[PDB]
């Protein structure tokens, strides 16, 4: 799970739409446009026979795919708390109107958010300017901060890249990328025909890292580290 | 009395073997046996026959009653009669188990023999169940069980006798 | 052969066995009585216990105090041996729960007969007919429940009937082990657990 | 033609010889006629059914097994008739009152690997199939006619003992009067009617089999399959049971044109897992007898979780439960233990809930966010088949006799949270809605997981960390406030444990020393629950009384010193909670009485909850 | 449909046996006497005891229970012969004389769960609770038609699958003579019988673990057509039958099963010397009854006294001007968690007659009052009574009363104020009787009672609703160590108790049909606390005493009412739970009447008035 927090006009939404375009089984949703019920699962009278029936929400429909949540901080707390079970336990348990069952929601959540006031503050830590709480912050394996600080040489290079992009895409780092068709084929082959297996990972290194990362997190208060960061290490290696 | 002890008494029954060894007459306390001549029949107790078969020293012959037609006739007679019919041996079930488990190679149609003896056993156990139920229901003080075998009695007799002891005391508790 | 066997119950006979744990436990069960004479100092247990007072006390104590002319006390039957419950037993003996109503139903009922109640004949016939009614189901379940959970079969049986049930189970298991050839092996005794 | 009857006769004879001749064992040990013996014992017990193994039948005669697989409906009735014959010749003679021979239900089981519900495709119609699933619904048991007789209204011409085909298929009454001449009137259009007194009927039941949760394709809802059960398969399962069904895939035979509704006629049920074999039984006696059974159980609770030993011990007490009681005046006292885990994230609360739901003999997991008052306790709704209001059980009803694992317990609405007060304390659900007025049973433990009001406990805040009411909090026997402690050696050991845990996933799942497998501990909990109800000993009760009074005085003085009410109250329900915990500890050991040691351990566990209060 | 042929030889043998049983003259004459009373009371159903039939003829009893229909028609024909022998004039008044059955039926005692298809055609005794009744509708059994053209009368008699007859019968209503003339029905000369369907449901406490209660449909005819109403716990003896149906040339083998009842028994409320001795021997029998009321709950003496007053009830007054005063007493308990409010409510549910359980979140207004449902027999919409309607002349126990919605409490306003509920639904606008006492239990807002807030804001309910309750008790978990010691001693003693028929290690059994006779088989201080079984009968006899108010007690009540008004004046706005009003005076009259009922005095004395004033003082003036 990934959280992109940061300033306006820093291509967070463009990243989310790219992941939507490239990935199979992508669900895109935004802020107030989502609900707890709509995200997870919903119960309705069946349209013709009128018995209560359970129905798939976004997280269930993305069960082996990606759920993309733009404007993540703009959601309601009641809507945002619905995704905890799907984020960690990878299930959605519903007990409503005689239905008592758990659905599979094994998706990857990629969220985009703004800090408080719409501008990240280096005077403060992430926990001090995000407005999210520890249970949801800890559920994101990768936690990115994107800033729009002034830097003239980088601004010049970025401007040249952007204007060149507008030239290249008219209707008519160094390393070179793959074509996107080839990348899609590569992705699905890598996901379905290949399965990594961990033999060893030099446990002392990661254990000591986690121990003093916990110490510094307790010192500064910047981010809770819990136990999930260890398992995030294993997941990222795989 | 245990089923193993009933088997111990069944083991005293005489069966015919064909030795592959030569041995003069042996004067056992329970009666002399032999001489043992290779290739000829000789009649010996079942424990000795089974031991010699296990030690590969003889070929066991089926008893005269271990024949499929004879056993079918006995089974049908048992199924038709209401009382226990006379059995071909007083330890026929034990004989069947011992001989067929240790000498099925020697005894042809052993599957048919085992199934027919099982049929006779089932019929006679059903008759014994009927006898016990009738005894308790009609409050008998005596029953006649002439053709039952020891294993057949011993299967149910401890339970039945205990029940009848309790029944007797219940029907005589007003005696003083 | 030389296994342990407890002293057998004598509760169905004219008197119970002195050394029988089953008879001791059976005679501990309480019996309703009325005091026909006052008992000094006994109000500490239930000052005197007054004359004509109703009590429920153990069967052993009632048998000790009772006499045929009722000087110390007079005895009432428990309700399960009175005419109301006798009729329920007469309806169908197989559906009643003699574990609740006992667990020593027959033994306790047999020992009630020594109080010279006018309905001793009815009690005796009731006990005998209850046993006759329940015999077939005890026999069938004991002799045909093999290598399974017998608790459902044993639940509603009184201690005498449960003893008979275990006897039938022993016979069944003995024959089945013989048939499967497991009776041949020499085994460490049940004390081998420690 | 009658050559078909000749084929039927020889096939029935071959089934009869299978049931007469099949044996298991070896000549070195001994032989037992498996199906003869089972027929005899079941008939004498009054059971009138047997279960045949497809592999045994195939070993005896593979053609019969192939015929049963391809054409189960045709050949199963021959097998059942042969079973009736063998039952007769195995049980004859019978006592009085048992002279009339009974029909035998032959059930089927196999060692073959099962198919999925989504494997059932049109190529397999009328074939014998084996599939797994979960029972999610079960109808009332009702009567299906197996034999009828029909009489003509004009001439009283009677057809006797008409064989009714099994399953959801019906029967067509003859269009015109049979075997007599076309007189005057020739026929009223339905000449026949079913005679009321001559019908022979058997029990039948309808169930819904849901696809297993791990069999569902990604993004799809689980599929449903209707099941027809018959005779002794009725009430053999309940909703919530995991089953492997053996049955005939078939169409009902009385959206689209040529559409036919399908179902499985169940021929055998294997509950995946009301009985313990004597070997399991005596092993459970041994396990209760050994002196450190409490520690062994606690180490068996969630073995993949590092630490949390007191929490695991309290969970063991919750799994075993106290003893339910009814007092002389008719009032009931709760036996189940309610436990709340409350605090920091990433502390394995959800993993403990997921373990307990799988380890408890009866267990359901639900999220607090995803639940409602009706869906938790019980719901009222109208049935499209008949316009009347019916009840449908919620989580509490489905978990009656076990545990409800309510994850995300702080997330549920307050109006939904007040629904479970009666079901938590009184263990009943009183409904008075739409004219139906009743009181259902909900005898189940609540194991709840929740976070702080501020995510982490944030120790300066104190009582402001809790938004739960004193009413709901007093209904929890133990309230484990769980705080993620940052200690360096603890973190190193925990990280090495987690890394080894992830590494060891490929190690073929080998057995382990000093703990109980989950499948065994589940059965052991069930055995102890059904067998043992302890009580307090007198001296133990005195100890508990005095300690309770001391704790009450301490709680009062703490609240007075604070000049504010604590969120966790110390009440008479907490006294009874200590009593229940002591009884659960004794029930682990199958002891009829709880000792001072059990009371001391119960007080030790409860004083963690009292630490959480003060 | 419905006609079946029987073997005449066995029919005559059975009829001979049953007539021998009924001709009881040489013996005690029990059934001679019972048939005499059947004639004398203008009855035509005899209730026979199968215990007596087993004593006289055991095999005939067994065949009766296992072959119900043929044996029952044989028995009814024997009964008609015997009643003709006693009184031949009376025997011709009725077409048929019926026999119902009582006693012990052995294994045929069942519940709706265990009542399987194996019991078809057997006599079964089903114990359960009534959940539905249909409307009583007539059923034609024998119709006479007059042919005006031919000037002759034909008479036809009918049957259906429900009504197996053992005589030739039709199922078509005629409209034409054999000469094709029209026929005119003679309704007065025709015979019709009442017919009703009810549903008996399994007792909820006896259901297995994960299961909802099961149901069986029961058909009641003749005198039995209104012998049970919804909410009654009943035992129905009858014949279990299936109804083979057909639908247009085809039949699904699924047949619905019904119990055709032959006897219906209530299981509630069912000599005077013990009660007379008690009331004369005891001093303040009210105190002994109140403290004996709920033994497993320590303390709460005044609340127990108030609940005893609720159980005994006041007296209902109707005045010459049509104004009305209720007799029912309403009690509200507001209190902290774990102060036994729910257990007191559960005690009243277990011991009072017609005590209906209810909870705030489990109920709705419709379920509280009445619902529209469709009669499955007919299809027409009609009313189905809710909880407070079922609780008429009884109690409704509302736990979690603060958790209830105001829209639901709107119904409770009308029920408490006027003893009725008015409805306008289905085809019917009607005024249903709901004359029930209310025993409500609630928590204060914020869960625990707050000492630093007024009682009228600790109590979350509005004063308009609070005016309805006669008494309002505040129950606080005072943490006094003395009370803690004695309470914990009592609680641990209760938790150490075990029942007599139960072994030391036994876990609590789940229920089953352990009642195996239609009447109780085993059948005043405890084994000097009063016994519960005696106290039920005592309260039953005391409820009907109807004592009159006396002048000196009236003067005392007037003096103390005015004094309580002055105390209300002097009380601060934090020192009262409720204001004092004319309804406080009415409460005093009701409580004094209940105390008089407890004494069985037939006159309200100063003794009663004193306790009434003390109880009202205790309830009203607290903080
Ligand atoms: N580094 C960049 N390279 C290229 N385009 C960029 C870059 N940063 C921003 N943009 C452009 O800026 C525009 C806005 O992108 P967008 O993704 O909507 O910003 P954002 O991260 O979503 N800010 P917000 O929506 O307020 O949270 C797009 O047209 C992007 O292409
Ligand atoms: N002590 C532990 N041992 C092993 N795994 C652990 C431990 N603590 C946490 N984890 C892991 O951390 C992850 C989160 O566990 P989880 O059960 O959700 O804890 P939680 O307290 O319920 N989190 P939350 O729902 O935010 O409160 C899982 O992958 C666990 O395996
Ligand atoms: N004074 C008491 N004596 C005996 N048992 C008591 C007493 N007070 C409480 N209990 C016990 O405490 C438990 C809870 O009682 P309960 O009936 O729920 O009180 P309550 O106030 O209605 N609970 P609540 O619904 O949260 O207000 C029961 O097992 C009672 O027996
Ligand atoms: Mg954006
Ligand atoms: Mg969690
Ligand atoms: Mg309550
Ligand atoms: Zn015809």
Numbering used by the authors:
A (entry chain 2): 518 to 689, 710 to 775
B (entry chain E): 1 to 176
C (entry chain F): 2 to 47, 58 to 205
D (entry chain 5): 21 to 274, 285 to 303, 312 to 652
E (entry chain 3): 2 to 271, 281 to 533, 552 to 555, 561 to 656
Please quote the authors directly.
Upon termination, the replisome is disassembled in two steps: first, CMG is ubiquitylated on its Mcm7 subunit by a cullin-RING E3 ubiquitin ligase (SCFDia2 in budding yeast, CUL2LRR1 in metazoa); second, ubiquitylated Mcm7 is unfolded by the Cdc48 ATPase (also known as p97 in higher eukaryotes), leading to disassembly of the replisome. Despite being driven by evolutionarily diverse E3 ubiquitin ligases in different eukaryotes (SCFDia2 in budding yeast, CUL2LRR1 in metazoa), replisome disassembly is governed by a common regulatory principle, in which ubiquitylation of CMG is suppressed before replication termination, to prevent replication fork collapse. Our structures show that the leucine-rich repeat domains of Dia2 and LRR1 are structurally distinct, but bind to a common site on CMG, including the MCM3 and MCM5 zinc-finger domains. The LRR–MCM interaction is essential for replisome disassembly and, crucially, is occluded by the excluded DNA strand at replication forks, establishing the structural basis for the suppression of CMG ubiquitylation before termination.
